[PDB]
Structures are given as C-alpha cells and as structure tokens.
Write a protein that binds this ligand. Structure first.
Ligand code: ADP
Ligand code: ADP
Lengths: 767, 771
C-alpha cells in the first residue's frame, strides 16, 4: 500500500532482528534503514540520507561499499555491536528462477573466525553466565580455538573470572542479577529457557554423541547451572553460524584449584598482557612473545594467565624446554613458514572458509610434515613428535584437489586443480576457444563483403558480437535486421554464433557450478579429519611456545625452577623480566623466605627500586609455574595457590578468601592518604594479618619507619631494605638489596641552617 | 696543503669561498631552481631532512656529495632545520655583473618570516655575558622589537632562562663561560663581541644618543650587560639582510617590577605549558580569547610578568571595566586585522613582500575605523589616540601599491595605477601589444594567402612568424629568417623588430621603475617604523584588554582589590582552568592576614587540596595582570614572589632549598605533601622544620598541605598557623568529595573506610588511639 515491496521484504528480515544492526545487500553496497540507519550513521561517521517513503514518511538510509564492508563491520564489532548480514540467496545455483533474501550470517563480537575481523593475536571468547543462589554457572567457548570449558564459581568473584577469561561477549538470562554491566564488554541477553540444564544436557549429549555428561566430569544435581550455561552457549553458536561447528574441544569442568589464583587487579598490576596505561608496550607477554606462529602467541597468553598448581603438569614442561635448548633454532626456522591453521580449522568448522585458506592449510600442513629429524626428548614432546602423522590425504589430497594459486572467490572461477576430476577437465577445455572456433568463424567470415577492418565483441548485454563502421552499413551474409541501437557506426547481430555462445557460456556455467559442487565435496572431509586438524594446530602451537621457552633460556640467563613440599621461596640473582630489557644494566638480587622467614618488610628511598623487586619475585614465581625458566641462577618454590598484588582500593580486604596457605602477597606502600596516624594503624593491622593471624608469606613495602620494629615482635617476619650512595656530590642507586632498615636521609644539598638543626633534632626524637 | 684548481671546478671554488666563512652552519647554495648543499653539509642535510643524498662532480679526484631542495619548498625545510636548532646561511648571487653572497642567515632566534613561526609563538634570542660576580643578560625579539637588558647572578640564571623561553642563546667562547644545559640552540661568539666599551659604542650609535644614562645603565656596574646587548646587536647585524631600526628603547629590568617566579613555579602552575609539556588546558589556553595573534603573544607575556606597580595594574583594570560594554564590536574589528607587528618586523629587516604591505595598509585602515567603536576614560584614551595618528602611512600605501599586488616584485604590477605617470605610460604599451599583433597578423593573412600563420614568441628568439618548409620557400625577402626546424621555419621582420624592441624595452624599464618605487616606499615605511610599532602595540594591548573584559562578562570574574597590609582575602574563589572541566565546581574562601599566615591543609586524596592551593596562587597571579579574578570579591596585599611545589628527592630538597632562603614577608608559598620519600621519621622531621620556617624566619603567606597528622598541632604553638581540611561525606556506603574548606583537621577516618573491609580491624583501632 504505502510501502515499496523492496521495503516489505526488508521489514520481513528486520522483524526477526530488532536487537542488532542489519546489513542489507543493495547492489554493490550494504545499506541500513530507519533506526539502523541513524545508529549506523552515528556509531560510524557515515553520511545519513533518505531513499523512499513509508506511510508518507521519508525513510532514512546509510550505506557502505562492498569492498570496504568487513573493515566497517569490524569497527562495528570493536564497538560491541552485532550485525546480521542479509543477502539474496537462491536454490540450485544462480537462482533457477527465484531468489529468497535471508540472513546468511550473523556477526557477533564473541564468535569471530575471519582474519579480517580479528587481530592476529586476539583471543575471542564468548562466555555464558547462569546465576541463581550462591554458586553460578560459568561456561565459555572460543570458536577460533575450539576451546569449550565450564566452571562453577561463586556469585561475584565472577568479576575476576571474567577479567581472567578476557571475554568479548557475555550471554545473560533474565530477572535478578548478575550486575557489573560495564565491567564486562558487550552483553547480549538471551531467553531464560536457553540456560536450562533441563535442555542443556540433552543438547550437549546430542552434540558429543554420548549418553551422559559424567565422562566430562559434569554431574546433573550439581553443575546443572553450568551445563545449562554450556547449553545456552551451544544454542547461540548454532544460531549465529551457518554450519554447526563440529570442532569444539569437549566439555571439561575447570576446578578452582588446578591453576594459581590471580584476581583482576593482580592481572592488571603485573602487566601480563596489557599495561595500566591501556596499551601493550612492555608487558610480560610482549617481552616473551618470541613465537613464530600466531597460535603459539595466543597459547603463550593462555599459559601466562593460567599457571598450574599441579606438580605433574609442569616439570613435564621443564622436560620439554630442557630437551629443546639444543634444537630450537631449526624449529622456528621452519615454524615461521606456516599460517594460522587454528583459525583455518575454525573457519572450516563454521563454514566460512575461502579457497585461499585451503591452499594455505595445505602448505602449512606439508611443512608440518617436514619436522621429522628434530624430535626425541622426554614424555610430552615424545607425544608431540608422534602427533604429526603428516596428517594423511588431508595434507595429500589437498594439493591434489586445490590449485597452487587458487582464485580469491569461488564465484570467480578456477579453484579445483587440473586432472582432479575428469568431467571438470573436459568442461574446462574451451579456454582455447577464446583463441579458436571464434577465430575460425571470424576469419572464414572475415570481410565476406568489405570494407574494411573487422573486430569482435564479447559484451554483457548482448551475446557474442561483431564490429562495423559508419558509412559501411548493411553488408552482412544473414542480413535479416535484428540490429540497433543507436547511431554512429552500426551493428547487426549474427544468427550462427548464437549457437557458439550457447556452448561456451554454458560450458563455464556448468564448470563453475560443478566446481562449487566438488568444492563443497572435498569441503565435507570432516567426518574424520577435523579432530586431526585441531590436534595438529594444538601441538604445533605448543611446540612453538616451548621452543620459544628454550630460546629465552639461552639468549638470556634463565634456570630451571625447583619445587618443594614445604612452603619456601628462595632465588639467587633474581632479575625482573620486563625491566631487564629497559635499562641494559640491571642488578640481580635474591629472595630468602621460609616458614620462619615468611614476611619481608621493605624500606628505602624512592628511586631505589623496591616495587621493581616485588614485581620481580612475583613475576618470577608466575613464570616458574608456567614451565618456562626464571631470570636467575637458581630458584626454589614450594606450594602456592594464589598471588596477590597492591581511590582507596580496599581490595586489600580481598586478601581474605578461600584457602590462604599462600606463598606470595605484594603490598606496595599501603597507607598513602588520610594521614600518617590512621594510615600507620591500618598498615600495622594489615601487616599483622599476613602472619599467623590468618595468612602467610608477603612482601611489604612501606615508607612507615615506625613499623620497621616488627621483626622485634614476630620472628617469622624479617626486615630488609634497599640503600643509596653517591661516591660524589650526587646520590645514585645501584639497586642492591641490603638487610636491615633505612635511612639517612640526609641530605639535603642546600636546605639552609635553621631547619637543619631541627631536621637532625626531630630525627633524634625518634622516641 | 698544495691543491687545485685543476682538481676543483671554478663553481666549486666559489662555493668553497662562501663555505669557508660558515664552517659551523649549513649553507643553502642557490643552484638554478634549487638550493644545494655539498660535502658534510650534504650528508647532514640528507640525514636531517630525509632528502636523497647524491653526487655532483669531483673534487681532488673524489666525487662531491650533494643534496638539494626545490626553491618553492625551501622555507618548509628551513622550518624543520630551525626546529632542530640549526642555522643556515642563504647563498644567492647578487649584482647590478654577479658575485656570490650570503644575503641572509636563518637562526632559531632571529625569525621574522611567518613560514618559520607559529601564530602565537614568541621568538627570543638571549645573550649572556658572565663576569662571575654578576651575569649580564640581554634579550631581543625581532618580531616585536623587544630589547631588554638585566643584571643577574649565576645562581639566579636558569630561572631567567626559563622565564624568557629563548629559542637561541649567545654565549662567549671563553673557557670561563657559564656551564648550562643545552636546551635551545647555543651559539658561541668571539668573546671580544661582549666587550663593554664596544657594546656601548654600538648601542649609542644604534639609538643616536650620547650615553646610556636615560636607559639606566652607564659603564660602571652595568658594563657586563652592556656587553651582552652589544653582542646581541652585532649578531642581529650579522644575520639579517637589512639592519632593523625597530628595536624599541632598551630598559634595564629590575627584580622589583614583576612578581618573581622560578622555573619550577612556572612549570607547576602550567601558565603557558603543561607538566607533560603541551597546550592541554593551561592558564594561557583557558584565557586565550584574543582576536589577534599579537594579542595572544602579549597575553602570554603578561601572564608570565605580573606587575608589582599597582598603579599600572589599576590602569589596566580601569581599561577593562570601561571595555565591559563595548568589547563585541571591538573584537569584531580587531579580528579582521593582520599581524602588523611581524609585518613591521619584516619591513625592518628588509624582508617584506608586496602583499605584506597590501595587508599593512588595509589593517591600518581597519584600525582607523576603531575611532568610533569605543570611548571611555583611562589608558584606553592613549590607545585610541594612537590609531588615527597612523592614517598617513595607510594613505601613502593606498596610493603606492595595488589593491592586490603580485606576489613577487620582480613580476611588476605591484605599484598602483596613477602613482607614477611614466610607469602608467610604460604600462600603457600593452594594447599596442596584442592589438598591434592583430593589426599585423590580419595584414599578413591576406598578404600571404595563409590563415596558417600567427605571431609567436619564445624567450630565445623573441617574436617571430613561422611557416612550413612548403610555405617557407614562398615567403618574401621582407622576412628575415632564423631558426631551422623540421616542419616549419621562423622569421622576424623589422616592422616587428621595432615592435619587439619597443615592447620589451618598455617591459624592462617598467620593471626597474617598479623596483625603485617599491624600494622608495620601503625606505619611507622604515622611517615610519616607530609609528608602526606604536600601532602594533596599541592594537595588541587593546585586544588583550578586550579579552579580559569578555572573560569577566562571560565567566563571572570580579575586579580584585589591592591593600597596603599583608592580606589574602578571596570570597569563594575558583580555579580558572579546572572550572571549565567539571560542569560543577565548588568555590572556596581564603582568609589570610598577618595573624593568619600559614594554612596547614590536611585530608584524603580526592579532597580538592592541590586544586585549592593552585587556585589561590593562580588568583594572586591573575590579580597583578589586570585581568579580573574568578571570585565574588578579592583583596591581595603587597606580593613579591610566588613559590610552589605541587620526582624525588633531592629535587624536593632543591626547590625547598630555594624557597626557605628566598621567600619573604610578601611571598606566597605553596607546599604540596613535602616529605614523600625516604621514610616517615626523617620526612616528618624535615616537614616539621620546613613548616617552622615560613611562620618564623620568613613570614610568608604559605599554604602547606601534608598527611603528617602530627603537624596538626601547630596552631597550638603558633598564632600564625591555622588548621583547614577538605570535605568528605558518606551518603550511601559510598565516599564522596564535595570539595569544601572546613576549619579543623578532618579527624581520623581511614579506619572508617571499613565500608569494604574485613577484620579484626581493631588491631588498627588499637594502634590509634595512641596519643
Ligand atoms: N635491579 C635494578 N637494576 C637496574 N635498575 C633498577 C633496578 N631496580 C629498579 N631499577 C630502576 O629504578 C627505578 C625506580 O624503580 P621503583 O621500583 O619504582 O623504585 P621504588 O619502588 O623503590 O620507588 C626504575 O626506573 C627502574 O628502572
Ligand atoms: N572545588 C572543586 N570543585 C569540583 N571538583 C574539584 C574541586 N576541587 C578539586 N576537584 C577535583 O578533585 C580531584 C582531586 O583534586 P586534588 O586537589 O588533586 O585532591 P588532593 O589535593 O587531595 O590530591 C581533581 O581531579 C579535581 O578535578
């Protein structure tokens, strides 16, 4: 009535998606209308205009070009918005008549697989949360890696798990909590019945082809909330991608004991993967990122955030890096030459993979087959040595199937190799007819009338065609009109080449359709081959990060960390990993902590370097529990469960919490603010909780001198410092750890002489 | 050293002739359409400017390294080179016939070209002549005619250097020269150029007077600064094409005319520069509402130089009060004037181009239109009296130059029509150009039967008529023939040789004539330089005062009051920069007298302590500039200096080491948490002693923020001390800071931050109480 049909179908699509933007394919452009038009013209800086009227109202519209579409929608998912992409799709091929217009894929900021949308070091996780009483169900998955885990956690404390997962999207039900909102990033809201164990268990069991989830360690009475979260995640993944991915790892209940505990503020303080200044310059991940492959880098981040508590999964890693120190160079001088086969396997699983990825996967897998000689170690890398079966006709029948240099698009043509399919072969051999047959009928009927020079014509409107001039007019052999338009050199169509295009045009029309058919065919080889791909990518990444761990333990002085059953922290000539590269003249120090030497009270002037030492030992323990070595001569670490580090952030209060038989707690000058009285009191009580009163093992830096007397009260809490000297008219710090307290101090290089005999006086009323 | 010159080309020998005079600078050697540098200059410029390094010719067998820049881009590269502190001699060829000359030396501190200066950029060169007992300072700004001398000391030197922000520093070459940071471009000079007697001769010559008494100098005690000024004048003479006669007077600066502030204080107060060194909201940027560039520069100068003489301050304030009701059309008028100050500078140094005059005359007329615009009663009346006095210059310029002259004087069409009758007649031979050529071509078509001939021209052959070799054989002997081509053949004929010599001769005479007339009006302008400088200064001052009036009207500023007794009274004042960043800013009072001299500020970390102190210091600074202050009312006593500190730790001991034995009864001192570092024993000892120095041995009005609570008990030991703290309120398990000064020391509430805490918090509550 008062709406264009081309708007009626659009509304038919938009009706199903009022919770995300809709890219609507219009010619060589993607366009959005109405509120999508205003919102898209706002989030981006896109010209807003008008095209058409609905009920007598000029409908607004914004547009982007097709060539720059993935860039713009990549900017849209960086903003945390979802976009449904609506194309015109037809049955059989090229639409044997009709065309449908439907949403072919839905792009969400947490289900990303294309290299055009992801940074080559981005980790993309979608986490679903299902809350209720105390415990809450936590389930996360990464499409690009196949990761798919679950976990039970407590209501709030969830924020630390969220900052640990670094989620790019959160799935949430309705009613009650959880809160935070802007402490996550981009939250999409799903129906409550999606989070039902009373449906989730069924969906999961069907997905993995098993009778129960007890094999994955998930019972039904407990865990129910988390199996429901996993079910909701599975549903979302199904609704977003065009194929249901069959590459997901396999459910596992993550225990809150298999990794060392690090809260959000601790992960930010130590600068594991990002700075406090919101960047990626000097982070622990950056100065260790010597991975030849992107997947190895991302895995390096994963290990950097998840150091394990088990005294059996590390030292295996030590048995790898130790056995790699004499063979790591020819491994990276080989791993540098492969591509992101992890994301490639992903795109094959979801179904958004283009031929270039098949080619690159073929090559990188063949190069993965050329490791061979570099092998033989202990336990784990004996598994990695055997994990490459070359990957059989998955690597072999990939070069046999796909060309060395395939086309960019499957609709351009020519992707499958020559001599791979016979009917294909005979259906190609008309590429010489651009040099034959038409030359035959074009020279045999070249100027059978004259004059003059004769040319040929392809044209898109009309079929194959021939040339002519102005004054030269009606000189034809068939002649019978069927001619114009228009004027200025005239044209008469021929009746016998309309049987020539009748076979070459159809020749390509069945060549490309067939090529799509068997491209889908050898695109199906996933019934047995997809897990092979996942295992290949996993082991390749692991070898990359481990060999990188071997390069760093020889180019820089790193030593195998030893372990112990008794709570101990000792290390000789310990160095800070990221600061060691910033000065080119770092001073190695030691730590000396045991059951009777557990708390260290640090003192010293400012630019002396106590923060650097604290972060030094903390990062050293972290690296020791990763598998890599530590910057030292030797280091011994007992058992440890959590690491804590420290606008009156009481979050010191967080130092409580489940299982406090810790071994590492950092406190840097707690007391700044309020006053010296109440600040000193709080620093005193806080310092006393860290020994016997509830907890154990701490590095306590403070300027409070009236607190250096604490070793006189508790023998387990010792006191050390860092000093300064000069050997001249200016004070310099060489940054050496020295036992005992402060302080001179002093000094003063010109502070008159009427405030000096009180600076020495009041600093002698040290009651 | 036996040498060429069969191993060096004559051109290269010329270049070495110029280069031997400038072994310390880059030399731009004019080479056709380019400026080229050779040898080490070529290598250095290749590094610095990212231009490709190449080779031209050979010297002593070795290829000559060369690097060039195109003429049209030269300025751009110069702009880079002076931003790297580099000086460049500009070798051109001059003559009537030609010799190689330097014509101009571009240095970081003698800039007058708009291509090499930002709009709001001050360009100062300062020469220091050290005696050791005292140090003479002389600074000049060519773009403003600024010329001032001062006697300082070695310990107070870097404070002056930081005050002046000089782009270039002239030092003597002696081994006893003062060691210092480097900084800006440091240029060392043949020590003899700092001579006191020679400098006195140079000054008395430049100004046309008998002695330097009127300026307040004379050779006895100011000798070293006289030598500094002499070095400055000599350097200006070496570097500029023409010797500028626009340097205003020469005042000896005393320590008693401006409110003194050290380098650290200028940096911390963020007057014209942030602590991160930007224009991210500073005092200048927040207050810069000037309509002219010269006005903005003057505003920066004023913000760095608050006046001690209250009479001048009050003259300014009268001006802004009078400008309250009339600053809108004033700003509209001044907004359409150009940088006549820099114009006068380029005229002075002999670097003005025709369109510069085309801006000077127009903006001078637009300034003459302000005679209405405003009235009133103050120093304003002098300012208004200045503008109509400069109308004659605008008239002579309206008569002498075109409404829009050409860019280059070498192209003619710069001198106006009707200004010179001989030029009008020489320029009149132009219809006789195209017209005669029509009355010739048409008289050759019918005469040769060829519509295939036109009169053509090139710079090599002149005018000619060309015919194809087919038609060439049929040409008359009336034609004369020259160039032999392939298809055609060119011919002149004496009836267009008379024409050719006629019009080309007229062109040359016209060009030379415009050259000499434009030069004439340039000499006249340079004689009118004092009135031009008065016009520029009057415009800039009026623009700054208009800006102050506008700020007071639109931001609720009030005229501060001045008292004869030590007092700082601010009825809820505001921080001028922070106030435009918070949507809501809480104003706060300040009551200080001889009995209340030291405020001991305490409290949490987000109660506006530092902002309050900076607010007080900034209102006192603004008070002595003529600008109205952000408050309901204010009253400040006699102030001499403003000290502040708002990494560690000897830098703290250094700044305090400056404050304790320099601050006086009239000083305003700001201390922000002194003691951070070392420990809480020694730091509290130092904070204690430092505090008991401002009330006692230098009765300065001090704001002293700290977290040492034991310093709270000073009002119970000193009548001068008082306790104030800033507000913190609990309204819903959540801390808020309403930022309000309250008498007293905030009490104890760090334990009260138990709003998110778990103890066993009594172990702290058992440490305090403890008295
Ligand atoms: N062992 C070391 N070797 C060399 N430089 C160091 C060392 N430890 C610290 N530094 C340097 O000393 C400076 C002060 O570091 P910081 O830990 O902040 O001191 P503090 O914590 O005592 O205030 C840093 O810039 C760092 O570069
Ligand atoms: N009067 C005020 N009105 C509004 N905001 C203020 C005011 N004073 C301070 N603030 C804000 O409070 C913050 C803390 O200022 P600051 O004075 O540095 O606290 P402290 O001195 O306790 O360290 C600043 O970011 C400032 O913007």
């Amino acid at each position: 009535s008062a709406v264009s049909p081309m708007m009626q179908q659009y509304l038919g699509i938009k009706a199903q998606h009022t919770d995300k933007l809709v890219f609507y394919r219009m010619g060589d452009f993607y366009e959005l209308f109405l509120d999508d038009a205003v919102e898209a013209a706002k989030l981006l800086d896109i010209t807003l205009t008008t095209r058409g009227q609905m009920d007598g109202v000029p409908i607004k519209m914004a547009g982007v070009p097709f060539h720059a579409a993935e860039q713009y929608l990549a900017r849209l998912v960086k903003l945390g918005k979802s976009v449904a992409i609506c194309e015109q799709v037809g049955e059989v091929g090229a639409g044997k008549g009709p065309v449908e217009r439907k949403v072919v894929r839905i792009v969400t900021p947490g289900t990303l697989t294309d290299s055009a949308l992801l940074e080559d070091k981005e980790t993309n996780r979608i986490v679903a949360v299902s809350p209720d009483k105390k415990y809450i169900g936590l389930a996360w998955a990464s499409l690009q890696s196949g990761e798919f885990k679950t976990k039970l956690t407590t209501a709030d404390k969830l924020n630390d798990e969220l900052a640990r997962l670094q989620a790019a999207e959160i799935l949430l039900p309705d009613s009650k909590n959880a809160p935070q909102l802007q402490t996550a990033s981009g939250v999409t809201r799903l129906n409550a019945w999606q989070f039902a164990a009373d449906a989730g268990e069924k969906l999961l069991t069907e997905y993995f082809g098993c009778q129960d989830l007890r094999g994955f360690g998930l019972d039904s009475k407990e865990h129910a909330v988390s199996i429901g979260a996993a079910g909701a995640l599975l549903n979302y993944i199904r609704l977003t991608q065009n194929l249901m991915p069959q590459h997901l790892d396999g459910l596992s209940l993550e225990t809150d004991s298999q990794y060392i505990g690090m809260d959000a503020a601790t992960r930010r303080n130590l600068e594991i993967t990002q700075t406090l200044s919101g960047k990626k310059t000097p982070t622990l991940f950056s100065i260790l990122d010597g991975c030849a492959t992107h997947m190895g880098s991302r895995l390096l981040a994963l290990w950097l955030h998840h150091p394990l508590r088990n005294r059996a999964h590390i030292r295996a890693r030590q048995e790898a890096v130790t056995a790699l120190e004499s063979q790591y160079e020819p491994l990276q001088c080989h791993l540098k030459s492969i591509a992101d086969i992890e994301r490639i396997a992903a795109r094959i699983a979801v179904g958004n993979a283009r031929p270039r990825d098949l080619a690159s996967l073929r090559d990188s897998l063949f190069e993965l087959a050329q490791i061979d000689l570099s092998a033989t170690g202990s336990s784990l890398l004996e598994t990695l040595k055997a994990v490459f079966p070359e990957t059989l006709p998955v690597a072999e029948t990939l070069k046999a199937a796909v060309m060395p240099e395939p086309s960019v698009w499957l609709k351009d043509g020519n992707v499958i190799n020559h001599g791979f399919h016979p009917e294909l072969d005979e259906l190609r051999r008309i590429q010489n007819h651009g040099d034959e047959f038409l030359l035959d009928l074009e020279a045999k009927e070249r100027e059978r009338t004259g004059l003059s020079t004769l040319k040929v014509e392809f044209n898109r409107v009309h079929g194959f065609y021939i040339e002519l001039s102005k004054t030269q007019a009606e000189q034809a052999p068939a002649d019978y009109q069927r001619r114009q338009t228009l004027k200025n050199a005239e044209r008469f169509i021929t009746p016998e080449l309309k049987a020539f295009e009748d076979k070459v045009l159809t020749a390509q029309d069945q060549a490309l359709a067939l090529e799509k058919q068997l491209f889908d065919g050898v695109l199906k080889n996933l019934r047995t081959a997809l897990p092979q791909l996942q295992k290949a990518a996993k082991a390749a990444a692991a070898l990359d990060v481990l060999s990188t761990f071997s390069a760093l333990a020889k180019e820089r002085n790193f030593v195998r960390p030893e372990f112990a059953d008794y709570p101990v922290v000792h290390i000789e000539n310990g160095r800070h990993p990221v600061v060691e590269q910033q000065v080119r003249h770092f001073t190695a120090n030691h730590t000396d902590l045991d059951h009777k030497h557990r708390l260290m009270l640090l003192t010293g002037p400012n630019m002396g370097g106590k923060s650097t030492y604290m972060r030094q030992v903390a990062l050293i323990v972290l690296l020791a529990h990763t598998g890599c070595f530590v910057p030292a001569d030797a280091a011994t670490i007992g058992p440890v469960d959590q690491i804590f580090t420290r606008v009156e952030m009481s979050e010191t209060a967080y130092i409580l919490h489940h299982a406090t038989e810790q071994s590492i707690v950092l406190m840097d000058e707690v007391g700044r603010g309020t006053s010296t009285f109440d600040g000193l009191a709080l620093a005193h009580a806080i310092a006393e909780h860290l020994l016997q009163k509830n907890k154990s093992f701490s590095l306590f830096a403070t300027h409070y001198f009236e607190l250096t007397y604490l070793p006189e009260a508790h023998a387990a809490a010792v006191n050390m410092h860092l000093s300064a000297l000069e050997q001249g008219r200016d004070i310099v710090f060489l940054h050496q750890i020295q036992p005992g307290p402060a302080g001179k101090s002093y000094g003063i290089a010109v502070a008159k002489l009427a405030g000096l005999p009180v600076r020495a006086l009041k600093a002698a009323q040290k009651h």
